[PDB]
Amino acid sequence: GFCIDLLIKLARTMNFTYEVHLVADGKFGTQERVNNSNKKEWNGMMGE
């Protein structure tokens, strides 16, 4: 799709490889509690 073509265009001027790994949670993720204590941890996308 769109972003894939963008990264391909990036590759042709940066000389680097890639191995796509799709998300294991299916979410963008925000600041949420760790569900074990008062600490807040990242979930969803940005935690990966």
Partner 1 sequence: NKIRSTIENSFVGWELEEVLLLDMSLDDGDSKIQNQLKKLQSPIILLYCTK
Map residues 6-45 to x or -, x wherever contact with partner 1 holds by CB under 8 A: ---------------------------x---xxxx-----
How many residues bind partner 1 (CB under 8 A)? The answer is 5
Buried b (16+ CB within 10 A) or exposed e, 4-42: eeeeeeeeeeeeeeeeeeeeeeeeebeeeeeeeeeeeee
Q: How far is the CB of 43 from partner 1 (least distance, A)?
A: 15
What residues line the site for partner 1 (CB under 8 A)? Answer: 33, 37-40
